[PDB]
Amino acid sequence: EEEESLAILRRHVMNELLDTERAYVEELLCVLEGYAAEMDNPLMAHLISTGLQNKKNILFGNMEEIYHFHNRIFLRELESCIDCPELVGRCFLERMEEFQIYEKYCQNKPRSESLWRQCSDCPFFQECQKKLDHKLSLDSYLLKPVQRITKYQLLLKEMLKYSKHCEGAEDLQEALSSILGILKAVNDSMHLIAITGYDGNLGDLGKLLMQGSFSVWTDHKKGELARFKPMQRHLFLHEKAVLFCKKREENGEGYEKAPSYSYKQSLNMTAVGITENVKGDTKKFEIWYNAREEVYIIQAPTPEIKAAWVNAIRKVLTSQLQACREASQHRALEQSH
Amino acid sequence: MQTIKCVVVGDGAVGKTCLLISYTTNKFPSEYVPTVFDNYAVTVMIGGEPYTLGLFDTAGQEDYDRLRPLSYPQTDVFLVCFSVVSPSSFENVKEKWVPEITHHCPKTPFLLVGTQIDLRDDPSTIEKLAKNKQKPITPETAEKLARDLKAVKYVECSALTQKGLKNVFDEAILAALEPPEPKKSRRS
C-alpha cells in the first residue's frame, strides 16, 4: 500500500535528519574543545602566538553560540518528532528566529578563511589535529555550519515529498519556504557587506529584498551611460531604494576572490517606476526614475529572475502607495477645524 | 599524511551526493538515497605512502553564490559534474561552474564529470528528453567541451552500477598530484 511506503520513507528522512544533527553537534564540540579551548592551554601556549590567540573569535565566529543552540534546543526538539516525522516542519517554524545566528557565522566565514590562509601551517594546529586523530583539517570543520544550514532545505523538501497526504504537509511547505527565506537573506547579505564607497548607513534603506548582477542599458531623457552596449551593474533592491554598484573584480594580495561592489548611485523608491515587458526579450524589464526622465533596461539571466524582481518591486511600490493613502487620510480627517 | 582536497560541484539533481555515497560505501543506496554527505576522509595509497583523500559535497549550496565559494579554498582538485541526461546541467558547466572555480582557484585542476550514464538507457528518461527536442549528451560532445574549457579530462560514471565510478576518483587523484600548472590545451 502506498501509504505504508511513504510512511517508511518518512522514517528514513527523520533518521537521516536526526543522525546528521547528532554528528553535526558532536563535530562542532570536538573542534570547540580540541582547538578553541586549546588556544588557552598553558601546555600549548608555546606553539601558538598571541596574535593568533586574540583572533580566536575571528577564526570560529559564533560557532559556540550555534553549538549551544543546536545542542540545547534544536536537537532536543527534533528528537521529539521521531514518532511522527511529518510534524518536523512545526519544529523549524518555532525556531526560525534562532537560525538568524547563521547570518553572523556566514558573514564572518571569509574573514576566518583569510586568517586560516596564513596560519594553517602553524604547529599549534598540526598538533591539535594529531591529538584528535583527525584526518581532515580544522577549516573543514569550520565549513560545517555553512553546510548544515544548506541541507535543512533539502531534508524538508524530501519529508514534504513523502507527506503530501499527511496532516502537516502545510507546515512542512511553510518550513521549507521559511528555511529558503533565511538562506536567501544570508546569501543576499554577503553581497551587501561587500559594498564599498557608500556614504551613509545602509541600514536606513530598509530591508534588503533582492540583489543580483545584470546587463543594463540606459534610455535617459534628452537634455555613466550605456546607450548601445550594455554595462554591468550589481543591483540591491531595498525597501527605500535601488542601489547600483559596479563589480570590482580586481584583487590585491592574499587574493580574496570574492568581488567587492563600488557604489555608483541610488534611486529613491518614492520616484521609482517599472515596465514589465520589453520588446524582443522576455527576460528584460525596466526601472525608471522621475517618470522616465531616467530609464534603466535590465536584462535578467532568466525569465524567472525577471519575474522575481518585478514582483518584489511591485510589492514595495504597492506598500508605498498604501502608506501615502493612509497618510493623506489622517491629515484629511483634519477637517475638524 | 598529505591531504588531497576534492570538491564536487555541479547543478542540483545531477547526482553529486549519490555519486560520493556510492564510491565511499561501495554500494548504491537501494531503498533510500541519503541527502547528506559529510566531509569524508578516504585513506589512499600513493607511492606506498598513505594519503588522505578528502571528499567534499556541495549539494544544497547550488543557489547561493556567496556561501558556495566558502568550500573552495585550498582545493587540490575539482569534479565539475553534469548529468548526461540533462542538457541544462551541461550548459551550466560552461556558463557557471568552470568560470567560477577558475576565478576562485586559478591553479586548481578540474575534471568534467558526466553522471547518471545508466539513464541513457532509461526509456522514461529518454522519452521526457524527447518531448523537448533533446537527447542525452554524448561522450564526444563532452570530450570537446572538456578540451575547450581546459579540463584535465572528461570522465563519466554511474552511481547506480558504479561503471566508471572508481576511475573518476583515480583520475582526480592523478590530476591533483600534478605540480602547480596553468590550464593547458589538451590534444585529441
What is the distance between the alpha carbons of residues B116 and B40, in angstroms, rounded to a whole number?
Answer: 22
Contacts of A327 (CB under 8 A, 6+ apart): none
Grid coordinates belonging to A85: 516525522
Contacts of B2 (CB under 8 A, 6+ apart): B49, B51, B52
- Tell me the residues of A at the B interface, defined by beta carbons under 8 Å apart: 9, 12-13, 16, 20, 23, 27, 106, 109-110, 113, 116-117, 120, 135-137, 139-141, 143-144, 146-147, 150-151, 153-155, 158, 183, 186-187, 190-191, 257-258
In contact, B37 and B175? CB cutoff 8 Å: no
AA identity, residue B61? Q
Strand extents, DSSP E, chain B: 3-10, 40-46, 49-56, 77-83, 110-115, 154-156
First to last CA, chain B: 36
Q: Which CATH number fits domain B1-188: 1.10.150.120, 3.40.50.300, 3.30.70.260, 3.40.1280.10?
A: 3.40.50.300
CA A95 and chain centroid, separation: 17
Residue A102 belongs to what H/E stretch?
A: helix A101-119
* CB neighbourhood size of A2 (10 A): 7
Domain boundaries, chain B: 1-188
What is the distance between the alpha carbons of residues A287 and A222, in angstroms, rounded to a whole number?
Answer: 17
Angle separating helix axes A144-161 and A101-119, nearest 10 degrees: 140
Grid coordinates belonging to B20: 560520493
- Residue B59 marked as a ligand binder: yes
| Spatial CA neighbour of A274 closest among A243, A251, A296 | A296
First to last CA, chain A: 75
| Spatial CA neighbour of A123 closest among A27, A52, A31 | A52
What is the distance between the alpha carbons of residues A169 and A175, in angstroms, rounded to a whole number?
Answer: 10
Tell me if residue A41 falls in helix, strand or coil.
Answer: coil
Domain boundaries, chain A: 1-193, 194-337
> In a 10 Å sphere around its CB, with 0-12 CB exposed, 13-18 middle and 19+ buried, how is residue A159 labelled?
buried
What is the distance between the alpha carbons of residues A272 and A295, in angstroms, rounded to a whole number?
Answer: 10
- Residue B61 marked as a ligand binder: yes
* CB neighbourhood size of B50 (10 A): 11
Residue A232 belongs to what H/E stretch?
A: strand A231-238
* CB neighbourhood size of B45 (10 A): 8
Burial annotation A64-98 (CB, 10 A radius, 16+ → b, else e): eebbebbbeebeebbeebeeebbbbbebbeeeeee
Q: How far is CA B146 from CA A12, A80, B20, B185, in A?
A: 38, 49, 21, 10
Torsion over CA: A186, A187, A188, A190 (sign) = positive
Experimental method: X-ray
In contact, B70 and B64? CB cutoff 8 Å: no
What is the distance between the alpha carbons of residues B155 and B171, in angstroms, rounded to a whole number?
Answer: 8
- Residue B164 marked as a ligand binder: no
Grid coordinates belonging to B152: 584535465
In contact, A146 and A109? CB cutoff 8 Å: yes
Q: Which residue has the cell 528528453?
A: B129
Tell me if residue A149 falls in helix, strand or coil.
Answer: helix
Contacts of A45 (CB under 8 A, 6+ apart): none
Q: Which residue has the cell 511553510?
A: A174
Q: Which residue has the cell 564599498?
A: A196
> In a 10 Å sphere around its CB, with 0-12 CB exposed, 13-18 middle and 19+ buried, how is residue B151 labelled?
buried
Query: Looking at chain B, which residue has its C-alpha nearest residue A182?
Result: B64
Tell me if residue A145 falls in helix, strand or coil.
Answer: helix
What is the distance between the alpha carbons of residues B68 and A143, in angstroms, rounded to a whole number?
Answer: 10
Query: Looking at chain B, which residue has its C-alpha nearest residue A105?
Result: B67
Q: Which CATH number fits domain A1-193: 1.10.132.20, 3.65.10.10, 1.10.10.10, 1.20.900.10?
A: 1.20.900.10
In contact, A23 and B38? CB cutoff 8 Å: yes
Residue B22 belongs to what H/E stretch?
A: helix B16-25
Grid coordinates belonging to B175: 590530476
Torsion over CA: A15, A18, A24, A29 (sign) = negative
- List the strands of the sheet with B110-115, edge to edge: B40-46, B49-56, B3-10, B77-83, B110-115, B154-156
| Spatial CA neighbour of B156 closest among B143, B147, B174 | B143
Shortest Cα distance, chain B CAs vs residue A158, angstroms: 8
Grid coordinates belonging to B120: 541513457
Q: Give the fold, CATH level 3, of A194-337.
A: PH-domain like (2.30.29)
Contacts of B16 (CB under 8 A, 6+ apart): B8, B9, B10, B57, B58, B59, B81, B115
**A1-193 matches A194-337 in fold:** no
What is the distance between the alpha carbons of residues A275 and A295, in angstroms, rounded to a whole number?
Answer: 10
Q: What is the resolution of this structure in A?
A: 2.4
| Spatial CA neighbour of A39 closest among A115, A102, A148 | A115
In contact, B100 and B108? CB cutoff 8 Å: no
Contacts of B97 (CB under 8 A, 6+ apart): B9, B10, B80
On the CB side of A295, CA atoms within 13 Å amount to: 16
